[PDB]
Amino acid sequence: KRFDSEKAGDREVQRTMLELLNQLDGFQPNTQVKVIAATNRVDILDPALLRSGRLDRKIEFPMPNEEARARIM
Amino acid sequence: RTRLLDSEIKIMKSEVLRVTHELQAMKDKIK
Amino acid sequence: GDLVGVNKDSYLILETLPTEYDSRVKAMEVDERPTEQYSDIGGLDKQIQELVEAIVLPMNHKEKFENLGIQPP
Amino acid sequence: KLLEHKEIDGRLKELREQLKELTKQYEKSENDLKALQSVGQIVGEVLKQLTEEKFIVKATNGPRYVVGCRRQLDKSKLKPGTRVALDMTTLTIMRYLPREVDPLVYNMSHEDPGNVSYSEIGGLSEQIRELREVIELPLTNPELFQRVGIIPPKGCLLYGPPGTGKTLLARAVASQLDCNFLKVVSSSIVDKYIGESARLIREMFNYARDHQPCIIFMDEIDAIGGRRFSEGTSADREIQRTLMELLNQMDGFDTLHRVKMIMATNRPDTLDPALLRPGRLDRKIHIDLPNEQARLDILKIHAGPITKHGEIDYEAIVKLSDGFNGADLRNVCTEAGMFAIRADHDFVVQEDFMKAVRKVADSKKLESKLDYKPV
Amino acid sequence: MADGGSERADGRIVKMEVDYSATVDQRLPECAKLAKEGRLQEVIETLLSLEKQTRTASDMVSTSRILVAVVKMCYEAKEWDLLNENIMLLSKRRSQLKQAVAKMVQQCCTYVEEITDLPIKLRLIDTLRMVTEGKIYVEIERARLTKTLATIKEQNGDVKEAASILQELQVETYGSMEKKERVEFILEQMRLCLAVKDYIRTQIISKKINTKFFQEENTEKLKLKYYNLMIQLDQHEGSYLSICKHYRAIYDTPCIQAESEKWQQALKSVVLYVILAPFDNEQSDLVHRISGDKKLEEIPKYKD
Ligand SMILES: Nc1ncnc2c1ncn2[C@@H]1O[C@H](COP(=O)(O)OP(=O)(O)OP(=O)(O)O)[C@@H](O)[C@H]1O
């Protein structure tokens, strides 16, 4: 999540990620790509990365209740 | 009955000119 | 931005190299493809279903999407 | 007895086609064999012109030289800072290209796609017409301004809620003029260096000084405009100096000629009040939330490629909507169609649209701070 | 509601053939309440279009019998109040005015042969407010051209109607895209500036002429006939040298014509303005650019 502050933070990275969206979508929009992202947390992400066509779905994974612990164990 | 003779001399000229298309092609292609 | 073969003397663009292999990316392509059937995913089977309806079927049948005629995810 | 005419005619046409195809590539290869004599010219640039034929130039990969042109190279057009190609051996000047391009400009200028015109938007006819007056007129006719005499204005700033189609309106302008669009996302400028940002600004403004009818568009100005507080930080002083590249270089000494500047932000409060004086940017025009023929007419543009029936109660959507942008109507029509994929209704039923209204109007819970009113 | 406007729309068509407009007074709060309901998409927009349509049947009853116009100003008094209660904020409930007022100018199309000027201009002072206020249309802008043209035809053009077109020249050039009929309206003020006899106002509205470009493709011969109005712009009052394109468009109109008299004055008017135009580089070459016609050397005044 971006900032308006000084001597701290990153203004880079997001160039790679808006270049990811930039080269991928819009510029000859072809449905020849599937974007799969698995973040541990969501609250650090920008709101401009998740809107409607950047990542369409928000698929949460809850805790293995009892039997997925015994199962995966 | 002479159009086949003129087109025939043009066909031997087509074999010579195709031999020079493979000389302009092949012989130049050597160098 | 290409690797090309150029004469040392005439400086003519002679041939294109078949060696543009791109470091790290072409190494980022997982070529082994380890196996994981869906018997391992225990507890997220609805997420398997919305996962397949979201992702797997746009790879197979866009006619499932565009005989209805909207968009893929 | 006439089969020999076609019997020699088809073979003559076949040997003529193979003769033309083989000898044609033999002639192209002969041009390549003559191109074996052709010499790679030298990339150099003019440092300064000394005399009529003495040219202080520099090799791009090293040393400096003084050479001359060929015979007819239009030496007056050689101005210091241009690029020349030189001879290899004699090293005299052979040609000059454009100058230079700095291809960070490439990946966002010709990145701009053509669009449908301002029929795509609606409910902004005051903005279309008056913003059309401040933009389109001095390239169609700047002499009505000169019949008056008074200089045309320069640029404006759009605001309102985010995502209301400021970018979409800029794409409508991108469909309207179709000429010289230089559209920058305007936050990728500070990489980690100081004057690199400025040097990209100077290069873009010099390219805009090159081409006459240039159009600039910028978005999310607050990451690059900012506000000058008391200096105690260490990273938006870069935005102060870069901001001063904007303060000078929207005016300069030379005014920009047919170089319009279209500005769009989400918060126009935190920008510099030094920027907020007119002349630089003439007016701050508000873009609102969509009204009901904006929701509807923009929705019906979105209801175009839809396998519907005589069922579509649109006011279920619109009256059950409460202000939703063009991409939110992409969300309504798209995810309503996703509910049409649910149980594989190959047609389009109206009741999925209300479901999309439920999902999106349900998903408005995470969003607040709906406005930023400038000045 | 749909059945609530189906019972009034279906249930109030009978009473127009017999009754005086007292069922219409039993429609003022019915259209007012159905519009206050106002189904937000296609329901009561169309049901109220039916009810304003049967209101125009009551206009065939009441406003086609006596032409009182007090019944009319009560009807657009409740159209005034009916435009008052709901916002219509680019809101799409508008066919209550579209074919209603389009049938009102259909009625005025049946009135200009029958009506005197006073109640029809009260109708015009209604629909100026109705269309300039209620979400400016496209076809009642051309009915605006014929209704302010009807105000022209009241006294057959004067300074007041020259002001009535000078207030309506460039207002609806940017709201509605148009190439034909308002271009046939932009030719109308030039005789409303020659009756004034104002050459510089003819050049102000000629600055209005050259803001309408791409004259071509509109109809088959729209602009070949419009060139008569383009040459009337500076015909007898025109200069000597600013008239080259002006005395070019005299000739492209009989270019269709195989005539030898009006096409002959197209020749002689495409050649005798060199006698107007003084010493020019454009003179001494265009006298041979236009030279090459077959019928041009067949005038001894052309030899002269
Ligand atoms: N006034 C309008 N007329 C027509 N279409 C509009 C209008 N406003 C928005 N849209 C639609 O909204 C979509 C997005 O518009 P746009 O990209 O301008 O959003 P934005 O205003 O740039 O938002 P933000 O600046 O907050 O990202 C476009 O596809 C466009 O069709």
From TrEMBL, chain D:
SUPFAM superfamilies associated with the record: P-loop containing nucleoside triphosphate hydrolases (SSF52540)
Binding of ADP 3, residues: 163, 165-168, 330
Protein keywords: Acetylation, ATP-binding, Coiled coil, Cytoplasm, Metal-binding, Nucleotide-binding, Nucleus, Proteasome
UniProt keyword Metal-binding, yes or no: yes
InterPro entries: 26S_Proteasome_ATPase (IPR050221), AAA+_ATPase (IPR003593), AAA_lid_3 (IPR041569), ATPase_AAA_core (IPR003959), ATPase_AAA_CS (IPR003960), NA-bd_OB-fold (IPR012340), P-loop_NTPase (IPR027417), Prot_ATP_ID_OB_2nd (IPR032501)
Binding site for ATP 3: 122, 163-168, 266, 302
Record: residues binding ATP 1: 122, 163, 166-168, 266
Residues the record lists as binding ADP 1: 120, 122, 163, 166-168, 171, 330
Subcellular location: Cytoplasm; Nucleus
UniProt: Mg(2+) 3 binding residues: 167, 220
Residues bound to ATP 10: 280
UniProt-annotated binding residues for Mg(2+) 1: 167
GO molecular function terms attached to this record: ATP binding; ATP hydrolysis activity
A Pfam cross-reference name: AAA
Residue positions binding ATP 9: 277, 280
Gene3D superfamilies noted in UniProt: 1.10.8.60, Nucleic acid-binding proteins, P-loop containing nucleotide triphosphate hydrolases
Sequence positions that bind ADP 2: 122, 163-168, 330
Binding site for ATP 4: 122, 163-168, 266, 302
Primary location class: cytoplasm
Binding positions for ATP 6 per the UniProt entry: 163-167, 325
Domain AAA+ ATPase residues, every copy: 152-291
Protein residues bound to ATP 8: 277
Binding site for ATP 7: 164-167
Cellular component aspect of the GO annotation: cytoplasm; nucleus; proteasome complex
Annotated family: Belongs to the AAA ATPase family.
Protein name as annotated: 26S proteasome regulatory subunit 10B
Source taxonomy: Eukaryota, Metazoa, Chordata, Craniata, Vertebrata
Gene, per the UniProt record: PSMC6
